[PDB]
UniProtKB/Swiss-Prot annotation, chains A, G:
Protein name: Histone H2B 1.1
Family: Belongs to the histone H2B family.
Glycyl lysine isopeptide (Lys-Gly) (interchain with G-Cter in ubiquitin) crosslink residues: 89
Record carries keyword Phosphoprotein: yes
Domain of life: Eukaryota
The species this protein was found in: Xenopus laevis (African clawed frog)
Function as written in the Swiss-Prot or TrEMBL entry: Core component of nucleosome. Nucleosomes wrap and compact DNA into chromatin, limiting DNA accessibility to the cellular machineries which require DNA as a template. Histones thereby play a central role in transcription regulation, DNA repair, DNA replication and chromosomal stability. DNA accessibility is regulated via a complex set of post-translational modifications of histones, also called histone code, and nucleosome remodeling.
GO cellular component: nucleosome; nucleus
Protein localization: Nucleus; Chromosome
Description of how the protein assembles with itself and partners: The nucleosome is a histone octamer containing two molecules each of H2A, H2B, H3 and H4 assembled in one H3-H4 heterotetramer and two H2A-H2B heterodimers. The octamer wraps approximately 147 bp of DNA.
Full protein: residues contained: 33 to 125 of 126
UniProtKB/Swiss-Prot annotation, chain B:
Signal sequence coordinates: none
Sites bearing N6-(2-hydroxyisobutyryl)lysine, chain numbering: 9, 22, 37, 55, 57, 69
Species annotation: Xenopus laevis (African clawed frog)
Post-translational modification: Demethylation is performed by JMJD6. Monomethylation is performed by KMT5A/SET8. Trimethylation is performed by KMT5B and KMT5C and induces gene silencing.
Modification N6-succinyllysine, positions: 9, 55, 69
Protein name from the UniProt record: Histone H4
Curated annotation (Swiss-Prot), chain E:
This protein's name: Histone H4
Stored Gene3D superfamilies: Histone, subunit A
UniProt keywords, alphabetically: Acetylation, Chromosome, Citrullination, DNA-binding, Hydroxylation, Isopeptide bond, Methylation, Nucleosome core, Nucleus, Phosphoprotein, Ubl conjugation
PTM sites of type Phosphoserine: 34
Sequence positions bearing N6-methyllysine: 7
Organism: Xenopus laevis (African clawed frog)
Cross-link (Glycyl lysine isopeptide (Lys-Gly) (interchain with G-Cter in UFM1)): 18
Family: Belongs to the histone H4 family.
DNA sequence: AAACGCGGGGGACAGCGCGTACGTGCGTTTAAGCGGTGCTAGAGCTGTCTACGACCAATTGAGCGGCCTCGGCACCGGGATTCTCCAG
DNA sequence: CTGGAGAATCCCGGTGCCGAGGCCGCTCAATTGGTCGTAGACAGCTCTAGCACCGCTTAAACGCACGTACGCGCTGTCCCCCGCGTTTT
């Protein structure tokens, strides 16, 4: 059966941060485990806010605010920048 | 400006009475005053985050309800 | 004179069937607006929002007291002390 | 023209096309913005690296070359931000931070 | 004779042994232990167990199976707000 | 004369050991039959996955573990070093779990 | 404009159990709030439930099952029968 | 490795003294709030129209199974160190 | 200070090995170029509610005395749990 996951992308980012460090498989599964969670928690949170303001389409305004809602403190501060930078980069590109 | 102190000792003592406390220290009052700020600050921070994203300048309780649930204290009685 | 610890029981007995607030609204209201100032400036409050806030806060405070009281009692006391709060504050895991 | 991945277009590594599909089947809304799959996807890269970099750090402190959940356990639980984030997360095989109570120390 | 019936006393719940219990407590950081703890622990652990197990089984039939899956119990854990990473 | 350690020095040594260790402390064969025991009061005759069978213990331990360290906090505040069930129940009540 | 709630359906039921008992508005708001929640709590899981088996249409079974997820024990047994009866009453006519 | 006995020793535990902080009480402030009057922000509404995603069609390559190989890593032993009791 | 002494722990070099990790075919999901319907932010109008303040009177705070009860420090005493070496399990 086919199963799609996130290992390869995580593997790429690791070699960005630690280009030499290896990795187990179980921990990789953890990473797959972790990503999907935060994937989920943001999205439904993203959904219900659009519900709160009775809108029907989810954009970054939605995404960013919940990131501020979901991430605490510095991560939210820093990651919004991470989101902000990419978005403008995409719109420009 | 010391509105935390506006929560008087009887205001503190009444709550502990309704909490069932018979005998109270004196250091309890400042301990309470600091901690309660944490409860408030956390909420109001997130509460306005609704109000801002909802593009208002006026605080609805409907935001407040949204947040207190989002903290995990579900509340009944103020619209929804 | 009544001996110490009698009025308190009557006070405790009194308030548990009492139901309305125990915090003054204006000292409540003012403190809220001061704290809210620290995240964004120049807000505007619905009385419901503030009132909804107030119900949460006292409802917050009282339960912790019971936990703290339990802490005090477990230390074989009848006199609460701040560490009981801190021990309580730790265990619920928001510490 | 020439096919160019959106992740490349954002200069990102995470597959946004995957999620825009996933958002599309995720039934979070009947319509979905275009930069939202993008917007999140980079922040996704942020935290993984943020944890992965921590995962690298602790991995070095025992002088290993490959990251394990114990390292992951240590890293996040050593991070007050991550630990506050992942307080309702329990880690498989992660173990515990070594910490003995002060009063259990012998006189 | 009469030895075919000499050991019928399993009664699983003690299967969580005192040495393990203290081994468990030792990892947790407890230095000295009451003896009644062991039994009391048996209660706390069990009462924990079914509540998930009930919920964990609660899934299974709805998807019309007969073999409990880890993913199933994975969801079982989430509902009470104690999430686990690492079994997909 | 025998060289016996002062009581507790061994325990602190033990406390150290496991806090670096990461493995399970509960024997598998006793463990799973416990679950196989339990399932009967909900539905008869299920069929367990080891992954599931394994996955039980981690929650089983991690739960009980966090219990312990909180219970350890109790006697300290209660000015003890030996844990009492009254501590254990207390936390669960403080955990709001009765 | 016209905003809708549940108090009227509440009040018939009130008169079904207590035909001569009043209810305050502060209470009536509470019930409107309360009922809205209980809808929501199940409503999500059953929605989630469908995703879990990769199925694509919510039925009463999921609701049935979802109720088994929330409500404690003896009460669950009651309503599930009542859930069972009504659809049976519905499906019969 | 658990079971299990077993001495033994240390910490719970109870009792005791004691001292001082905290409740009782109460005048004396004092501050809390109400309703009455003034105001305007700003939210909430409608209308509207537009631009952008939902939609489909065609397409290809990225990504994931499937498959190799050796390098991280876990002992093993010994020896070296350190520490704990237990001298002194 | 210093440990007789045993015991415990860490570190140093060897071993074996299998799993992390690049390589190797292959298909269907992600990307590109088309259409058309609607969502939804935005000006214009509406007006509600939010804020500002006063002034006054009374509950409620507030600032004190006093007294005693409880918090705590301390000390023998007793018994249950801690270290350990076999004997089961």
């Amino acid at each position: 059966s086919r199963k799609e996951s996130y290992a390869i992308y995580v593997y790429k980012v690791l070699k960005q941060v630690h280009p030499d460090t290896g990795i187990s498989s179980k921990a990789m599964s953890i990473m797959n485990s972790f990503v999907n969670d935060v994937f989920e928690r943001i999205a439904g949170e993203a959904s219900r806010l659009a519900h709160y303001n009775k809108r029907s389409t989810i954009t970054s305004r939605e995404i960013q605010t919940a990131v501020r809602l979901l991430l605490p403190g510095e991560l939210a501060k820093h990651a919004v920048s991470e989101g902000t930078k990419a978005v403008t980069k995409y719109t420009s590109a | 400006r010391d509105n935390i102190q506006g929560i008087t000792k009887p205001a503190i003592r009444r709550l502990a009475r309704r909490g069932g406390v018979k005998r109270i220290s004196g250091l309890i009052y400042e301990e309470t005053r600091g901690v309660l700020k944490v409860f408030l600050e956390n909420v109001i921070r997130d509460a306005v985050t609704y109000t801002e994203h909802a593009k208002r300048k006026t605080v609805t309780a409907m935001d407040v309800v949204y947040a207190l649930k989002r903290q995990g204290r579900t509340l009944y009685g103020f619209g929804g | 004179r009544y001996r110490p610890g009698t009025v308190a029981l009557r006070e405790i007995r009194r308030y548990q069937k009492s139901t309305e607030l125990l915090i003054r609204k204006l000292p409540f209201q003012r403190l809220v607006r001061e704290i809210a100032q620290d995240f964004k400036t120049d807000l505007r409050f619905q009385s419901s929002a503030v009132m909804a806030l107030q119900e949460a806060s006292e409802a917050y405070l009282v339960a912790l007291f019971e936990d703290t009281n339990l802490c005090a009692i477990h230390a074989k006391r009848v006199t609460i002390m701040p560490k009981d709060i801190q021990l309580a504050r730790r265990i619920r895991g928001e510490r | 023209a020439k096919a160019k991945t959106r992740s490349s277009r954002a200069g990102l590594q995470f597959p946004v096309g995957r999620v825009h599909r996933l958002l599309r089947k995720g039934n979070y809304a009947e319509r979905v913005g275009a930069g939202a799959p993008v917007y999140l996807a980079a922040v996704l890269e942020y935290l993984t690296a943020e944890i992965l970099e921590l995962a690298g750090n602790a991995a070095r402190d025992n002088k290993k070359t490959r990251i394990i959940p114990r390292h992951l356990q240590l890293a996040v639980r050593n991070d007050e931000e991550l630990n506050k984030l992942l307080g309702r997360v329990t880690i498989a095989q992660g173990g515990v931070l070594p910490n003995i109570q002060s009063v259990l120390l012998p006189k």
